[model samples]
Target: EVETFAFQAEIAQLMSLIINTFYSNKEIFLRELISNSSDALDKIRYESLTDPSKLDSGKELHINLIPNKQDRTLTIVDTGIGMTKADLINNLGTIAKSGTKAFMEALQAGADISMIGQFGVGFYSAYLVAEKVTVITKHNDDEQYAWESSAGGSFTVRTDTGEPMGRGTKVILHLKEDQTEYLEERRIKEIVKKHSQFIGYPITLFVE
Candidate 1:
């Protein structure tokens, strides 16, 4: 099944603002994505404490980055808590509606997860360098789904039958021609060092 939804007015405005305001700091988009991945990792770890089934069996929790020079894309994959179809729409399609923020807050009244999600709009930063972004996700309780958008007026979500994601998210960022620098291995290493070196989970970048 496939469905498309127009971006909420606030989401469009937020994307425009992020693209324009951070035009010079496009690399920050990578940082935002990494932070989001960390939040997902934390969510699964916490939930698994109550229900071990939430864990992805023996798979270690971590984030992986793959820069495909041939494809002109940067893919960030996380073995963390993934999203459902509804999550793809509400968390990503709506500006200021963050699944991470809600999840963290719901777990504890005033607990701090050291999450960057309080900003709630960090995910929109993907528009800074990506012409199109595709998110393939699988949650413990829901079927895998693929969400795609170009930071345009609308985005689409469909059931994913291509690959098994297991229980995590894989974000494929189709970089803009001018923003291809993000697909550089050296640049990605530098960005991760400068921004997310201290992230709790291991971040592995495939080289080859």
Candidate 2:
């Protein structure tokens, strides 16, 4: 299910919120995104408890940060519960509507029938430095689809032709012009170890 949307007026306020919210330092973006990934892993493992099938694949779940200075891209990969088509539309459009609070409350209540716990509205922080963002995810019910946006008030979601992720989500951020620091191996490592070491899951920085 592919869909298109304009930023709308609130989107401007949304942008302003992000800008002012992280005015001091923007490195928190990775911290939030990484924590979000950890939450995804935590939720899936939490759910597999009753069903068993959720973790039947026998694959080691993890979070990976792939940085490419050459292409100026930072990709976050996770082997967790992916989203369905409707989830893509809802999740993609949600942050702008009521911040992560709206969906977050639903998650804690019944959306995923769960919330990974205080995950915050961190994903949108990526817009602080990414000129374009892409997400390819595969869930038991949704298969695999690609969601793309420039954060300029609109986004697109459609069937992804790329190889199936098996069961996971991939987020690729095209760094903005001045965001060159994010593409550096050392910088990424520092940031990861700086704010991510406390995360329960294993976080790996891919720099090759």
Candidate 3:
């Protein structure tokens, strides 16, 4: 079933002032997305402690970056806690209802000064470099679903009919006009290691 949700007034405005206001440090939306991915992986690890079935066999717990130069897409795929439709609505839609003011303050204080958006708005940071974002995710409890948004005021979620991930999430970022630098594999490696070296999981880059 495909459904759409309009962004709440809080989130709509938050998106407006969020990404563009910061980014003095040359910007890295991948950093923010990775943070969310790491957090998702952490959640599943914690859940699987009591219920081992929550774990996926044969799938290594890892982050994979696939760069598509021709498509101008950078994908971050993770074997982590995938999101449900409701979770997507809440996590990605309702900003003012959550503790986003702190995120707002953190943004104003200079995003590079520290990590902001740990409060849940971090995913939207992808809008910094992407004109559109698509997410395909599967959870043990919820099957598979796709979420799409343009950083405008609304988003849609639908059943995913593509190849199954078994479990986890994959975020695809469509590059902005001036953001072609992410196409370089070497630059991406440096970007990930520099910003997310302390993460608890292995980060793999796809190279041809």
Candidate 4:
């Protein structure tokens, strides 16, 4: 069964602001996402010290960028600490209610918008270029699940029965017609070099 939930008030407003305010810098979306994946990878590795079982995702952790021109989608997959249902709700639903509240307040006071990443709302930046975003994730502790949104008022979460994503998370961004430039491996490689080179995890871009 699929469950649908409305976007939190602050999340709705924050997404609106992000899409409109950062339209010109749409490439930042990839940077933010890669940074987020890197964070999760670091976390899983760090936690593995006490419980080696956490390394079940795989021995060699990495991130993969697959751009499907035919599908007009770009997928970013990582072997990281994937989220559980509650984790998805907490992290992506209210989105750290406190941080979002602070972000809203900061926006009202006219502060640096660069803090978007620091405030942990970077995931929402996917809206800058994608028409829809889908996240399929699995954790060592919970069953696999998927979350999807179109940056609309509501989103959906359901047990994913299709993809056999062993562990970690796969984020697929369905590009808008005009934003299909991201479907090219060349463009993706350029973006990765510009924004994600310092990421210690192996970031591989699959070329057609």
| Candidate of highest TM-score | 4
Candidate 2: tens digits of C-alpha lDDT, residues 146-205: 988876667788899888678888899998888888878888888888878888877888
Candidate 1 TM-score, true structure as reference: 0.86
Worst 10 residues of 3 by lDDT: 108-117
Specify the highest-lDDT model's number: 4
TM-score of every model?
A: 0.86, 0.81, 0.89, 0.92
Clashing pairs in 1: none
Q: List where candidate 1 sits over 4 angstroms from the true fold.
A: 56-58, 91-118
What is the Å distance of residue 58 in model 4 from its true position?
1.9
> In model 4, what lDDT does residue 185 have?
77
Candidate with the larger lDDT of 3 and 4: 4
- The candidate, 1 or 3, that scores higher on TM-score is 3
Q: Mind giving the per-residue lDDT tens digits that candidate 4 earns over 74-110? A: 9999998889988877665655666777877887788
Kindly state the number of residue pairs that clash in model 3: 0
Residue pair clashes in candidate 2: 7-153, 107-114, 110-113
Angstrom error of the Cα, residue 137, model 2: value is 1.0
Report the lDDT tens digits of candidate 1 across residue range 57-158.
436899999999899889999988899877888855554645444633543565332232456656767877888999999998899899998876788999
TM-score of 2: 0.81
**Candidate 3: stretches off by over 4 Å:** 19-22, 56-59, 91-96, 106-114
Q: Supply candidate 4's per-residue lDDT for 172.
A: 96
